[PDB]
Amino acid sequence: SMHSDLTFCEIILMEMESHDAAWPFLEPVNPRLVSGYRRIIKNPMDFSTMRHRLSRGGYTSSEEFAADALLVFDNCQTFNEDDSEVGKAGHIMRRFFESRWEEFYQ
Ligand SMILES: CC(=O)c1c(C)[nH]c(-c2csc(N3CCNCC3)n2)c1CCC(C)C
Ligand SMILES: CC(=O)c1c(C)[nH]c(-c2csc(N3CCNCC3)n2)c1CCC(C)C
């Protein structure tokens, strides 16, 4: 399971999931709702996958956790136009994440 030293990451992820712009990213991108996603996006990521990975001990370090967070936002900007609803949400969430991360990494 998760080491207590990563509790700050668990909290950041909880706060991300609660954010008004998080709704696109809560669960894996759903083939029932959009086609051609995994054709393009070779490493899908979403907050529920991260939540389960963190809780089971699948992140040994905070850097591995942060890499998956950034993968959510990198995938979003690779697939979606910047002015689309999901594209805009990804930019909001990246800023929110990076602002929280910078409290710890400075
Ligand atoms: C392609 C993409 O990057 C997307 C991401 C990260 N999310 C979503 C999305 C949209 S609507 C929804 N849910 C989740 C589950 N609950 C119902 C609503 N997820 C997309 C598809 C965008 C567009 C093609 C509709
Ligand atoms: C239910 C669902 O599967 C959905 C699919 C495929 N797309 C969208 C979507 C994208 S953007 C937008 N709007 C609505 C009108 N006002 C705000 C912008 N709805 C949804 C609703 C999901 C909900 C979590 C927001």
Numbering used by the authors: 1794 to 1899
Sentences from the paper on this structure:
BAZ2A is an epigenetic regulator affecting transcription of ribosomal RNA. It is overexpressed in aggressive and recurrent prostate cancer, promoting cellular migration. BAZ2A, however, features a shallow pocket, making it one of the least druggable bromodomains. Here, we describe a structure-based fragment-growing campaign for the identification of ligands of the BAZ2A bromodomain.
Extensive contacts with Leu1826 and Val1827 are formed by the bulkier substituents of compounds 78–79.
